[PDB]
């Protein structure tokens, strides 16, 4: 029948992005060695890796003292870091590093004398690969001049020492003729952009924005993220925050979050915190500058006990992302549907099939599934047994007929139906 395409380590789950480590685990303990009690927590969401913030020593805007080969001593020391990498494989969670030299100036790439900067990061690839870490990340490559010609050898060396590494690039330009002009010959790298950033006032362009991208890409493997370094909630309403992790997980790509968005952390309505890096609220002792803006349910220790949270969803949607086979590497078919929603399917011949129906409206629309276009190897049955619903009030386990479905307003769905063919 079918011989399985090979599985690498990062199709099999989720990433995680941390910008400011001192902001992640709370104040004071801004050490690399501090985030080792937290790695038991990150294996609750079961992400299959994380990218760690830029810890190389870097005087702001200074060329001669900006060295990618040693840790900025605010964060700890180099021998602290090998205790981090060794302890992380106790939970099978990879580590990736930033390699943008400037990250305290505005332009993050030192636009004057470009080639010496790339020459600096070219040597920096070899030392960290011999240091045992696996994967890098560059941001704002459009600030770098001629970024495609330099993207080759950085891909080449991280494929050189092994082929189980990773090389993530980033950009901001959301035009498709710039985006796939990077992926045209450079195919074995992930990329994150601001392509899905510009929502058309609560998601009017989204059902086109997934499909046009997923068609023009030639069905490679890509990566799904709102932006390269910012949170989820700095673009969206807080009412759509349960209808994107449903979409960002079951799409065919690599889910790239940031930190704190498994709470749905709000950078707004928190004063004194910057736009790039709020603090993550482990319990009530995470923000003592003001006791007022921190509620009870905006914390981990508020949502870890309620099953109808956002985190309790996120502990049962990433779990379905890494486990079931069709959501891993399956095939994606988005059939036509009603006026103001978006829906698709994922199939893998004899495995389970997962039916997704979303609701980007604001009303109580009834779901008109008007498919008629699928192959008969994967087409609609009568009933589906309703795996997951983003809003409480239904069964999550009952078989429901499809053409009398009656979605609630702003509710997406996860429907699981067997082969039966």
């Amino acid at each position: 029948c079918r011989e399985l395409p090979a599985q690498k380590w990062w199709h099999t789950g989720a990433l995680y992005r941390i910008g400011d480590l001192q902001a992640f685990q709370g104040h004071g303990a801004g050490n690399l060695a501090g985030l080792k009690g937290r790695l038991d927590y990150l294996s609750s969401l079961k992400v299959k890796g994380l990218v760690l913030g830029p810890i190389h020593k870097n005087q702001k805007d200074d060329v001669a003292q900006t060295d990618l080969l040693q840790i900025d001593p605010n964060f700890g020391s180099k021998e602290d870091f090998d205790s981090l990498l060794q302890s992380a494989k106790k939970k099978s969670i990879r580590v990736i590093l930033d390699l943008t030299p400037n990250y305290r100036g505005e332009n993050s790439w030192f636009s004057t004398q470009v080639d010496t900067v790339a020459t600096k990061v070219k040597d920096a690839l070899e030392f960290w690969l011999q240091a045992g870490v696996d994967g890098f990340q560059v941001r704002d490559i459009e600030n770098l001049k001629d970024a495609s010609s330099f993207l080759a050898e950085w891909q080449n060396i991280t494929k050189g020492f092994s082929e189980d590494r990773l090389l993530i690039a980033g950009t901001n330009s959301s035009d498709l003729q710039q985006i796939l002009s990077l992926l045209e010959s450079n195919k074995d790298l992930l990329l994150t952009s601001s392509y899905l950033s510009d929502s058309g006032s609560t998601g009017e362009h989204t059902k086109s924005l997934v499909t046009q991208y997923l068609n023009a890409t030639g069905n490679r493997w890509c990566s799904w993220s709102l932006s390269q370094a910012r949170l989820l909630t700095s673009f969206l309403p807080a009412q759509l925050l349960r209808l994107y992790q449903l979409m960002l997980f079951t799409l065919p790509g690599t889910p790239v979050f940031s930190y704190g968005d498994e709470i749905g952390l709000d950078a707004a309505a928190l004063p004194g915190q910057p736009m790039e890096a709020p603090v993550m609220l482990w319990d009530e002792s995470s923000f003592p500058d003001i006791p007022g803006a921190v509620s009870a349910n905006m914390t981990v220790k508020g949502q870890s006990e309620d099953p109808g949270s956002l985190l309790s969803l996120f502990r049962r949607l990433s779990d379905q992302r890494s486990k079931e086979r069709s959501l891993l590497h399956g095939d994606f078919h988005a059939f036509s549907a009603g006026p103001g929603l978006f829906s698709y399917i994922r199939h893998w011949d004899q495995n389970e099939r997962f039916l997704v129906v979303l609701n980007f409206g604001d009303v109580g629309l009834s779901a008109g599934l008007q498919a008629s276009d699928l192959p008969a190897s994967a087409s609609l049955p009568a009933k589906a047994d309703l795996l997951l619903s983003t809003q409480p009030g239904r069964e999550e386990g009952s078989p429901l007929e499809l053409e009398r479905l009656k979605l609630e307003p702003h509710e997406g769905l996860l429907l699981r139906f067997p082969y039966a063919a």
């Epitope: 910057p274 009530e284 002792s285 500058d289 003001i290 803006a293």
Partner: antibody
Framework: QVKLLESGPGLVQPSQSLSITCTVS????????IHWVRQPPGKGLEWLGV???????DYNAAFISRLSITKDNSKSQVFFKMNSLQDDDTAIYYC?????????????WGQGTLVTVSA | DIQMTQSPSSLAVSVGEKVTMTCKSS????????????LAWYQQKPGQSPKLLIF???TRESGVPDRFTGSGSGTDFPLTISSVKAEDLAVYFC????????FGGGTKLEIKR
């Protein structure tokens, strides 16, 4: 030391614009926030928005975007811009400062500026 | 949003005696992970913009004589003056930290003579 002095126009007409520049003399802005607090005379104090050390800007709940406070560390000037003034906003407008991160107002400018709105 | 109901509108007390300035609010001011309650008091001399007196509901700022000290816990708290001088004639404020919309109102001190 901690020394303030600000530059207000004194009086502008109803439904007009305003510009108050607090020139902080002696201490750098980038570790201490700067509020603004208004006072109609003989009455209580009412908050206006802060500018933190980063560039994060807040406002009050009573008006989210009537106000526009911009900080510029070029000449240690903290710009203030309020639009659509009325005669019900004649008040003392003055600069302020917090204790490092929380809201203990360590000083104020001891003079302030008394602005009134009339034709 | 918290509001700070201060109890006396004004108070008239001759020199050397003891007064109580209290304030009442809606919520519990004691952030329970600490044991402190978030609070301040201000002294507006006439013609001048005010200055600090007390932070964290019971301390002193550096350079303020110890006739004034604050007590109270939870929602209701006084100031108390252990003896009143002649220069201490002013307007006293209750102002807020806990939620981010912060303020209260001002009472008046007058003196018998």
């Amino acid at each position: 030391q901690v020394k303030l002095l600000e530059s207000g126009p004194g009086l502008v007409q109803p439904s007009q614009s305003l510009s108050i520049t607090c020139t902080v003399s002696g201490f750098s802005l980038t570790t201490y926030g700067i509020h603004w607090v208004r006072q109609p005379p003989g009455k209580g104090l009412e908050w206006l928005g802060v500018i933190w050390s980063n560039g994060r800007i807040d406002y009050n709940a009573a008006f989210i975007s009537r106000l526009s406070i911009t900080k510029d560390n070029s000449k240690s000037q903290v710009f203030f811009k309020m639009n659509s003034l009325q005669d019900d906003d004649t008040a003392i407008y003055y600069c302020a400062r917090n204790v490092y991160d929380s809201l203990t107002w360590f000083t104020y400018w001891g003079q302030g500026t008394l602005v009134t709105v009339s034709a | 949003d918290i509001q700070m109901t201060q109890s006396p509108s004004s108070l008239a007390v001759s020199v050397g005696e003891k007064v109580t300035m209290t304030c009442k609010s809606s919520q519990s001011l004691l952030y329970s992970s600490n044991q402190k309650n978030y609070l301040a008091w201000y002294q507006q001399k006439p013609g001048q913009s005010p200055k600090l007196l007390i932070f964290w509901a019971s301390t002193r700022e550096s350079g303020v004589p110890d006739r004034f000290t604050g007590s109270g816990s939870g929602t209701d708290f006084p100031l108390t003056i252990s003896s009143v001088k002649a220069e201490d004639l002013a307007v006293y404020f209750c102002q807020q930290y806990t939620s981010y919309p912060t303020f209260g109102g001002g009472t008046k001190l007058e003196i018998k003579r």
